[PDB]
Amino acid sequence: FRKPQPFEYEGTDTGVVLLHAYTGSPNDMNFMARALQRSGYGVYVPLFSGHGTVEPLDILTKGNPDIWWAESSAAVAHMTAKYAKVFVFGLSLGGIFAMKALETLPGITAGGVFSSPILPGKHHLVPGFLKYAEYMNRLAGKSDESTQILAYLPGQLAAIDQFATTVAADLNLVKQPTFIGQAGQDELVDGRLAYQLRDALINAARVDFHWYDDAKHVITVNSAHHALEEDVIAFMQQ
């Protein structure tokens, strides 16, 4: 098993922070990061605590939204030290921190989300996490950990939602141009909430909203990624 590491591409004038998904890793952003590099952007993809190991329990016992927020904030600061302009985007979980960054951190030009409605709703992250863990255990030749996982999973999902509702309540603080991309066949989160995210951004200079009709949740990796990359790059060029 290869532990995905954080990675960085050097640019000149503009840098981009890409924040990965829950149970995800910097691998979530490989295609996006390279697309940005081909267009001359600097890119930084951090690793969230507890992620990127062969042991799914690490996510539940070594990471939490407060740590991940600190890591997101540190990632933004790393890039704003170097580049004239910095953009911050996030996939699902990462999108929560991307929006909180726009709301509360200095020096960010613009940013937004990939399949991250922010407003909590009906989701399928419990089955999603369990399927992820089952796949990881099958890779590592390890026995099932579902009972151990279920002692933590409801609580951590609740913690993420709790963090998210605060971010949602502060959406009025966002003044930067904001990008919203949402999968149209999203099996993990309620895509309808992306419309509520859009409508809550009452003070954003602009809201660039894109719906990826036939795509499943992870639009940075699946069939939608070429379209998403083009739309994100067009947004940045504006």
Q: Which residues are catalytic?
A: 92, 186, 217
Which DSSP category does 56 fall into?
T
Nearer to Cl ion, 116 or 178 (CB): 116
- Coil vs helix vs strand at 109: coil
Could you tell me the smallest distance in angstroms from the CB atom of residue 137 to Cl ion? 20
- Residue 129 in contact with residue 105, Cβ under 8 Å? no
β-pair type (110-114, 178-183): parallel
33: contact with Cl ion by CB under 5 A: no
Q: Between 65-80 and 93-104, two packed helices, what is the crossing angle to 10 degrees?
A: 60
CB of 23 to Cl ion, least distance (A): 7
Identify which of residues 21 and 236 has a Cβ nearer to Cl ion in the complex. Answer: 21
Q: How far is the CB of 190 from Cl ion (least distance, A)?
A: 13
Residue 88 DSSP code: E
CB of 220 to Cl ion, least distance (A): 12
Nearer to Cl ion, 14 or 116 (CB): 116
SS3 50: coil
Which residues fall within 8 angstroms of residue 215, CB to CB, at 6 or more apart?
A: 183, 184, 185, 186, 222, 223, 224
C-beta nearest to Cl ion: residue: 92
Element (H, E) at 68: helix 65-80
Nearest to Cl ion of 13, 66 (CB atom): 66
The site for Cl ion, by CB under 5 A, has a size of: 4
In whole angstroms, the minimum distance from the beta carbon of 3 to Cl ion comes to: 19
Tracing tokens 């004239």 back to the chain, one arrives at 84
Closest of 65, 43, 227, 57 to residue 145, by C-alpha: 57
Q: What string marks each residue from 68 to 97 as x (binds Cl ion by CB under 5 A) or -?
A: ------------------------xx----
21 or 36: whose CB is closer to Cl ion? 21
Binding mask 6-25 for Cl ion (x = CB under 5 A): ---------------xx---
User: By C-alpha distance, which of 43, 92, 46 is closest to 68?
Assistant: 46
Note the residues at the interface with Cl ion (CB under 5 A).
Answer: 21-22, 92-93
